[PDB]
Protein backbone atom coordinates (compact mmCIF):
# COMPACT_ATOMS: atom_id res chain seq x y z
CA UNK A 1 0.00 0.00 0.00
CA UNK A 2 2.78 2.45 0.89
CA UNK A 3 4.73 1.91 -2.33
CA UNK A 4 1.55 2.15 -4.41
CA UNK A 5 0.58 5.40 -2.69
CA UNK A 6 4.01 6.98 -3.14
CA UNK A 7 4.16 5.89 -6.79
CA UNK A 8 0.71 7.37 -7.42
CA UNK A 9 1.78 10.60 -5.71
CA UNK A 10 4.92 10.76 -7.86
CA UNK A 11 2.91 10.24 -11.04
CA UNK A 12 0.34 12.87 -10.01
CA UNK A 13 3.02 15.44 -9.18
CA UNK A 14 4.90 14.73 -12.43
CA UNK A 15 2.02 15.15 -14.90
CA UNK A 16 1.89 18.38 -16.86
CA UNK A 17 -0.55 17.77 -19.72
CA UNK A 18 -3.94 19.38 -20.04
CA UNK A 19 -6.77 17.85 -18.01
CA UNK A 20 -9.84 20.02 -18.67
CA UNK A 21 -10.79 22.95 -20.93
CA UNK A 22 -10.71 25.12 -17.79
CA UNK A 23 -6.92 25.32 -17.99
CA UNK A 24 -7.04 26.56 -21.58
CA UNK A 25 -9.90 28.95 -20.80
CA UNK A 26 -7.93 30.50 -17.93
CA UNK A 27 -5.31 31.81 -20.37
CA UNK A 28 -7.99 33.23 -22.66
CA UNK A 29 -8.41 30.49 -25.27
CA UNK A 30 -11.93 29.47 -26.29
CA UNK A 31 -12.12 25.67 -26.25
CA UNK A 32 -14.65 24.99 -29.00
CA UNK A 33 -15.14 21.26 -28.34
CA UNK A 34 -13.79 18.22 -26.52
CA UNK A 35 -13.62 15.14 -28.74
CA UNK A 36 -13.57 11.86 -26.77
CA UNK A 37 -11.45 8.89 -27.76
CA UNK A 38 -13.04 6.56 -30.32
CA UNK A 39 -12.56 2.90 -29.41
CA UNK A 40 -13.75 1.94 -32.90
Amino acid sequence: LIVSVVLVLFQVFLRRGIESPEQLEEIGINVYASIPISEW
Partner: protein, 170 residues
Amino acid sequence: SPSAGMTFISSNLAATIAITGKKVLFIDADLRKGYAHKMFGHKNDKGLSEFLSGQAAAEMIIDKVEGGGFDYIGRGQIPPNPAELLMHPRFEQLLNWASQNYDLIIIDTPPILAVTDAAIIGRYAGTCLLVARFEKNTVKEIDVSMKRFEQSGVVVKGCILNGVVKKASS
Protein backbone atom coordinates in the same frame (compact mmCIF):
# COMPACT_ATOMS: atom_id res chain seq x y z
CA SER B 1 2.80 18.80 -31.91
CA PRO B 2 2.44 15.99 -34.47
CA SER B 3 0.03 13.11 -33.86
CA ALA B 4 -2.43 15.44 -32.14
CA GLY B 5 -5.47 14.94 -34.36
CA MET B 6 -5.35 17.59 -37.08
CA THR B 7 -6.11 15.14 -39.90
CA PHE B 8 -8.63 13.14 -37.86
CA ILE B 9 -10.58 16.23 -36.79
CA SER B 10 -10.35 17.93 -40.17
CA SER B 11 -11.45 14.93 -42.24
CA ASN B 12 -14.29 13.96 -39.91
CA LEU B 13 -15.50 17.57 -39.74
CA ALA B 14 -15.45 17.77 -43.53
CA ALA B 15 -17.55 14.60 -43.72
CA THR B 16 -20.06 15.81 -41.12
CA ILE B 17 -20.43 19.14 -42.91
CA ALA B 18 -20.75 17.46 -46.32
CA ILE B 19 -23.57 15.16 -45.17
CA THR B 20 -25.77 18.24 -44.62
CA GLY B 21 -25.94 19.12 -48.32
CA LYS B 22 -23.12 21.70 -48.39
CA LYS B 23 -20.23 21.22 -50.80
CA VAL B 24 -16.92 20.82 -48.97
CA LEU B 25 -13.33 20.90 -50.22
CA PHE B 26 -10.57 19.27 -48.18
CA ILE B 27 -6.98 20.32 -48.87
CA ASP B 28 -4.14 18.31 -47.33
CA ALA B 29 -1.41 20.94 -47.15
CA ASP B 30 0.78 18.65 -45.02
CA LEU B 31 3.40 18.38 -47.77
CA ARG B 32 5.74 16.41 -45.50
CA LYS B 33 3.89 13.44 -43.98
CA GLY B 34 0.32 13.71 -45.29
CA TYR B 35 -1.67 10.53 -45.94
CA ALA B 36 -5.17 11.81 -46.74
CA HIS B 37 -5.13 10.08 -50.12
CA LYS B 38 -4.38 6.80 -48.32
CA MET B 39 -7.43 7.22 -46.08
CA PHE B 40 -9.76 8.36 -48.89
CA GLY B 41 -8.91 6.04 -51.78
CA HIS B 42 -6.53 7.71 -54.16
CA LYS B 43 -5.23 8.50 -57.60
CA ASN B 44 -1.96 9.74 -56.11
CA ASP B 45 -0.85 11.46 -59.32
CA LYS B 46 -1.15 15.26 -59.49
CA GLY B 47 -1.36 16.21 -55.83
CA LEU B 48 -0.93 19.67 -54.36
CA SER B 49 2.83 19.71 -55.02
CA GLU B 50 2.42 19.01 -58.74
CA PHE B 51 0.11 22.03 -58.93
CA LEU B 52 2.26 24.42 -56.89
CA SER B 53 5.38 23.62 -58.91
CA GLY B 54 3.40 24.49 -62.06
CA GLN B 55 3.34 21.08 -63.78
CA ALA B 56 -0.42 20.57 -63.34
CA ALA B 57 -3.69 22.44 -63.69
CA ALA B 58 -6.37 23.14 -61.08
CA GLU B 59 -8.75 20.46 -62.40
CA MET B 60 -6.73 17.22 -62.29
CA ILE B 61 -5.90 17.66 -58.59
CA ILE B 62 -9.47 17.50 -57.23
CA ASP B 63 -10.86 14.03 -56.50
CA LYS B 64 -14.01 12.58 -54.93
CA VAL B 65 -14.15 10.62 -51.69
CA GLU B 66 -16.12 7.39 -52.10
CA GLY B 67 -18.07 7.22 -48.84
CA GLY B 68 -17.72 10.94 -48.12
CA GLY B 69 -19.43 13.56 -50.26
CA PHE B 70 -16.68 16.15 -50.32
CA ASP B 71 -13.84 16.76 -52.74
CA TYR B 72 -10.20 16.56 -51.74
CA ILE B 73 -6.74 17.57 -52.95
CA GLY B 74 -3.95 15.30 -51.76
CA ARG B 75 -0.39 16.45 -51.24
CA GLY B 76 1.01 14.28 -54.02
CA GLN B 77 4.74 13.69 -54.33
CA ILE B 78 6.82 14.94 -51.41
CA PRO B 79 8.75 18.00 -52.62
CA PRO B 80 12.23 19.00 -51.41
CA ASN B 81 11.15 22.59 -50.64
CA PRO B 82 7.65 22.55 -49.12
CA ALA B 83 7.73 25.84 -47.21
CA GLU B 84 9.23 27.57 -50.25
CA LEU B 85 6.52 26.11 -52.49
CA LEU B 86 3.68 27.27 -50.24
CA MET B 87 4.75 30.90 -50.72
CA HIS B 88 4.00 30.78 -54.45
CA PRO B 89 1.07 33.01 -55.50
CA ARG B 90 -0.51 30.06 -57.32
CA PHE B 91 -1.56 28.79 -53.89
CA GLU B 92 -3.56 31.98 -53.29
CA GLN B 93 -4.97 31.72 -56.82
CA LEU B 94 -6.12 28.17 -56.06
CA LEU B 95 -7.77 29.25 -52.81
CA ASN B 96 -9.49 32.23 -54.45
CA TRP B 97 -10.80 30.05 -57.27
CA ALA B 98 -12.01 27.34 -54.88
CA SER B 99 -13.76 29.83 -52.58
CA GLN B 100 -16.11 30.75 -55.45
CA ASN B 101 -17.09 27.14 -56.22
CA TYR B 102 -17.41 25.57 -52.75
CA ASP B 103 -19.32 26.34 -49.57
CA LEU B 104 -16.45 25.38 -47.25
CA ILE B 105 -12.71 24.80 -47.63
CA ILE B 106 -10.82 23.00 -44.86
CA ILE B 107 -7.01 23.02 -44.95
CA ASP B 108 -4.96 20.55 -42.93
CA THR B 109 -1.51 21.78 -41.95
CA PRO B 110 1.58 20.40 -40.22
CA PRO B 111 2.29 21.48 -36.63
CA ILE B 112 3.56 24.98 -35.94
CA LEU B 113 6.11 24.14 -33.24
CA ALA B 114 7.91 21.94 -35.81
CA VAL B 115 7.65 23.68 -39.19
CA THR B 116 6.36 27.01 -40.52
CA ASP B 117 3.90 25.80 -43.18
CA ALA B 118 0.87 26.53 -41.00
CA ALA B 119 1.88 30.17 -40.52
CA ILE B 120 2.44 30.63 -44.26
CA ILE B 121 -1.00 29.20 -45.07
CA GLY B 122 -2.79 31.06 -42.27
CA ARG B 123 -2.66 34.37 -44.14
CA TYR B 124 -5.40 33.26 -46.54
CA ALA B 125 -7.45 31.34 -43.96
CA GLY B 126 -10.61 33.05 -42.77
CA THR B 127 -10.67 31.05 -39.54
CA CYS B 128 -7.91 29.15 -37.77
CA LEU B 129 -8.31 26.58 -35.00
CA LEU B 130 -5.68 24.76 -32.98
CA VAL B 131 -5.99 21.14 -31.89
CA ALA B 132 -4.65 20.16 -28.47
CA ARG B 133 -4.18 16.56 -27.40
CA PHE B 134 -5.66 15.75 -24.00
CA GLU B 135 -2.70 14.44 -22.00
CA LYS B 136 0.24 14.97 -24.35
CA ASN B 137 0.24 18.70 -25.05
CA THR B 138 0.59 21.33 -22.33
CA VAL B 139 -0.86 24.78 -21.73
CA LYS B 140 2.61 26.22 -22.34
CA GLU B 141 2.85 24.60 -25.79
CA ILE B 142 -0.58 25.90 -26.79
CA ASP B 143 0.25 29.41 -25.58
CA VAL B 144 3.55 29.33 -27.48
CA SER B 145 1.70 28.22 -30.62
CA MET B 146 -0.84 31.03 -30.21
CA LYS B 147 1.91 33.63 -29.82
CA ARG B 148 3.86 32.24 -32.78
CA PHE B 149 0.74 32.54 -34.92
CA GLU B 150 0.25 36.09 -33.62
CA GLN B 151 3.79 37.10 -34.59
CA SER B 152 3.33 35.84 -38.15
CA GLY B 153 0.08 37.78 -38.58
CA VAL B 154 -2.48 34.98 -38.14
CA VAL B 155 -5.32 35.40 -35.63
CA VAL B 156 -6.28 32.06 -34.07
CA LYS B 157 -9.98 31.78 -33.28
CA GLY B 158 -9.63 29.11 -30.60
CA CYS B 159 -8.62 25.63 -29.55
CA ILE B 160 -10.13 22.15 -29.86
CA LEU B 161 -9.32 19.58 -27.20
CA ASN B 162 -8.97 16.01 -28.42
CA GLY B 163 -8.50 12.50 -27.11
CA VAL B 164 -10.63 13.12 -24.02
CA VAL B 165 -11.22 10.26 -21.58
CA LYS B 166 -13.41 10.14 -18.49
CA LYS B 167 -11.31 10.72 -15.36
CA ALA B 168 -12.74 10.31 -11.86
CA SER B 169 -10.49 13.11 -10.58
CA SER B 170 -12.48 15.69 -12.58
